[PDB]
């Protein structure tokens, strides 16, 4: 019975959003992840260890693909993850990591309870020219679209990672605006 | 950069420890009870501190074990070392042929202290 | 039971034997950041504990080191290696490291 989590990659940041009803956690300054949730502490700790070790020895961000390989390996030698990061190898990237330890790349992805629902809407709205703010709003929309109760800054939560500001979890303000702005913007007609 | 030692007194301990001459160089610590044949490796453990680009540390069982006491002892020991020496460290807890559990429960705190002390001497 | 050797950017080696496993460090300018377990099925099977588990150079270096033991150094099988990933000549390198392992009688 997994809970909703959504990611949308763009050319100016990846955006992770969840149904709050602590589900977005930082792995490194350039890599967050959102999850469907206490079986995780070990994967998270591991992830972080890998990230920090690499960074210390190389003095650079770890390759998000390598990082996702490292966490999937852990499961492979036997819980569900949306890992999102920026690196200088393949820029913005988004991955889905299954409890199985198989992972795949995506550009939009939804996991959890309304996730066949959302993935359709993702599919016919995603394109490679979307701005971060479009994506921000897009995630909010899908989240209202599927949520049990209404959408306020208290039961859904946003975050993003960008080349320049590293990872971020939006506080209730930034998000208070955006949910209000999705209200105004979807009242055009 | 490596030292064999037996730390005397509360039982006697064996300690193989690799460390720096002179910051990316990790402390390495193998440690069991000394004996009067010899030892097996029970848990290997790693830790590395977070930077102030963010007093936590982070770490993982390199070679895990079923036994909580050994895990916690090897974790706790690596956590504290890495934090206090601001270096990564690898710690092995070894185990003697028929080593009784109590010997650990009864010497957790003491082994930590005599290890902090040793490293503390051998660096500063 | 400890053995160790140092030679020449400098390469350091150290091993620690037990009933159940060996445990080898291969440091480069004191550096060490990856950990592989090279155990065998009885009658080899590398597992990545910390590092790049998809680097194809890895299980080659490991299975080499594992043979240098199993069938040339002694005196149901398990080694643990911790090393500087920065080491990867490149076959010339593996040969040097392996001669460094024998120079402390492993």
| Rounded-to-integer distance, Cα A8 and Cα A134, Å | 10
CB A166 within 8 A of CB A178: no
B58: chain A residues, CB-CB within 8 Å: 45, 48-49, 52
| Rounded-to-integer distance, Cα B115 and Cα B7, Å | 9
- Say if residue A174 is exposed, middle or buried (CB neighbours under 10 Å; 0-12, 13-18, 19+): middle
Mapped onto helix, strand or coil, the DSSP state of residue C78 is: strand
| Rounded-to-integer distance, Cα C28 and Cα C57, Å | 17
- Identify which of B35, B39, B104 has the alpha carbon closest to the alpha carbon of residue B70: B104
| Rounded-to-integer distance, Cα C13 and Cα C2, Å | 11
Which method, experimentally, gave rise to this model? X-ray
| Rounded-to-integer distance, Cα A59 and Cα A161, Å | 19
CB A189 within 8 A of CB A39: no
B59 → chain A, closest CA residue:
A49
B1: chain C residues, CB-CB within 8 Å: 12, 30
Q: Are strands C22-28 and C78-83 parallel, antiparallel or unpaired?
A: parallel
What is residue C91's DSSP assignment?
S
B63·C37 Cβ contact <8 A: yes
C1·B38 Cβ contact <8 A: yes
User: Is some CB atom of chain A closer than 8 A to the CB atom of C90?
Assistant: no
A62: chain C residues, CB-CB within 8 Å: none
- Identify which of B16, B49, B37 has the alpha carbon closest to the alpha carbon of residue B97: B37
- Identify which of A115, A119, A81 has the alpha carbon closest to the alpha carbon of residue A101: A81
A77·C47 Cβ contact <8 A: yes
Entry field: residues in chain B: 124
- Identify which of A27, C26, A72, A42 has the alpha carbon closest to the alpha carbon of residue B71: A42
Tally of structural domains, chain B: 1
First to last CA, chain B: 15
What is the CATH topology of the domain spanning C1-106?
A: Ribosomal Protein S5; domain 2 (3.30.230)
Tokens 């590398």: give the residue: C46
Resolution in A: 2.9
Query: φ and ψ at C93, to 5 degrees?
Result: -65, -60
| Rounded-to-integer distance, Cα A108 and Cα A114, Å | 15
- Identify which of B92, B63, A136, B48 has the alpha carbon closest to the alpha carbon of residue C35: B63
| Rounded-to-integer distance, Cα A6 and Cα A114, Å | 10
| Rounded-to-integer distance, Cα A58 and Cα B6, Å | 36
Reading the block at residue C94, the tokens are 């593996």
| Rounded-to-integer distance, Cα A3 and Cα C53, Å | 30
Interface chains of chain C (3 or more CB pairs under 8 Å): A, B
- Identify which of A24, A20, A5, A35 has the alpha carbon closest to the alpha carbon of residue A113: A5
Question: E-assigned strands of chain A?
Answer: 5-8, 14-19, 24-28, 31-35, 81-87, 91-97, 103-106, 108-111, 156-162, 166-169
Q: Widest CA span of chain C, in angstroms?
A: 39
Is the bond preceding residue C75 a cis peptide, omega within 30 degrees? yes
Angstroms from A48 CA to nearest CA on chain C: 11
| Rounded-to-integer distance, Cα B29 and Cα B47, Å | 12
Q: Which residues contact residue A128 at a Cβ distance below 8 angstroms, ignoring those fewer than 6 apart?
A: A10, A11, A107
What is residue A59's DSSP assignment?
S
Reading the block at residue B13, the tokens are 């301990």
Domains, chain A, ordered by start: 1-189 (3.60.20.10)
| Rounded-to-integer distance, Cα A184 and Cα A78, Å | 48
First to last CA, chain C: 11
Q: Which of A66, A78, A103 to mutate to test the interface with C (most CBs of C within 10 A)?
A: A66
CB A33 within 8 A of CB A17: no
The enclosing H or E element of C35 equals strand C34-39
**HEC letters along chain B:** CEEEEEECCCCCEEEEEECCCCCCCCEEEEEEECCCCCCEEEEEEEEEECCCCCCCEEEEEEECCCCHHHHHHHHHHHHHHHHHHCCCEEEEEEECCCCCCHHHHCCHHHHHHHHHHHHHHHCC
Give A 63-92 residues with CB within 8 A of chain C.
66, 69-70, 73, 77
| Rounded-to-integer distance, Cα C34 and Cα C91, Å | 19
Cβ count within 10 A of residue C102:
13
B24 → chain A, closest CA residue:
A57
Angstroms from C53 CA to nearest CA on chain B: 14
CATH number at residue B62: 3.30.230.100
CA C50 from centre of chain? 14
Range of the domain at B16: 1-124
Nearest neighbour of C23 by CB, restricted to B24, B25, B92: B92
User: Rounded to the nearest 10 degrees, how much is the dihedral formed by the CA atoms of B106, B112, B118, B121?
Assistant: -130
C52·A66 Cβ contact <8 A: yes
- Identify which of B47, A46, A56, B27 has the alpha carbon closest to the alpha carbon of residue C86: A56
| Rounded-to-integer distance, Cα A14 and Cα A85, Å | 7
CB B118 within 8 A of CB B31: no
B48·A46 Cβ contact <8 A: no
């Amino acid at each position: 019975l997994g809970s909703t989590a959504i990611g949308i990659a763009t050319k100016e940041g990846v955006v992770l959003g969840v149904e709050k009803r602590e589900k977005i956690v930082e792995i490194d300054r350039h890599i967050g992840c959102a999850m469907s949730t206490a079986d995780a502490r070990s994967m998270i700790e591991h992830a972080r260890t890998a990230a920090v070790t690499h960074n210390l020895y190389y003095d650079e961000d770890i390759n998000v693909e390598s990082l996702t390989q490292s966490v999937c390996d852990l499961a492979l030698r036997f819980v569900a993850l949306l890992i999102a990061g920026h690196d200088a190898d393949d820029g913005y990237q988004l991955f889905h990591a299954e409890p199985s330890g198989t992972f795949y790349r995506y550009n939009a992805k939804a996991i959890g309870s309304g996730s066949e629902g959302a993935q359709a809407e993702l599919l016919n709205e995603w394109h490679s020219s979307l701005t971060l703010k479009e994506a921000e709003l897009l995630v909010l929309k899908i989240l209202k679209q599927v949520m049990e109760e209404k959408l306020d800054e208290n039961n859904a939560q946003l975050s993003c990672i960008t080349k320049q500001d590293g990872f971020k979890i939006y506080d209730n303000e930034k998000t208070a605006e955006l949910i209000k702005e999705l209200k105004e913007k979807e009242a055009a007609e | 950069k490596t030292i064999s030692r037996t730390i005397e007194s509360q039982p006697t301990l064996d300690v193989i420890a690799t460390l720096p001459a002179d910051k990316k160089i990790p402390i390495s610590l193998v440690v069991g009870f000394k004996q009067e044949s010899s030892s097996s490796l029970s848990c290997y453990y790693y830790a590395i501190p977070l930077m102030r680009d963010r007093s936590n540390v982070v770490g993982i069982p390199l070679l895990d074990t079923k036994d909580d006491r050994i895990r916690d002892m090897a974790r706790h020991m690596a956590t504290i070392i890495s934090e206090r020496f601001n270096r990564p460290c690898y710690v092995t807890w070894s185990s003697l042929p028929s080593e009784d559990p109590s010997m650990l429960v009864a010497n957790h705190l003491y082994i930590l202290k005599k290890c902090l002390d040793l490293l503390k001497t051998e660096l500063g | 039971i400890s053995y160790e050797f140092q030679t020449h950017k400098e390469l350091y080696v150290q091993a620690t034997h037990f009933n159940n496993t060996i445990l080898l460090q291969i440091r480069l300018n004191g550096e060490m950041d990856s950990t592989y377990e090279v155990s065998s099925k009885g009658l080899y099977q590398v597992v990545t504990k910390l590092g790049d588990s998809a680097d194809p150079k890895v299980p080659v270096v490991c299975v080499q080191i594992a043979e240098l033991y199993r069938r040339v150094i002694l005196p149901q099988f398990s080694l643990l290696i911790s090393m500087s990933s920065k080491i990867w000549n490149d076959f010339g390198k593996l040969v040097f490291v392996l001669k460094c392992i024998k120079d402390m009688y492993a």
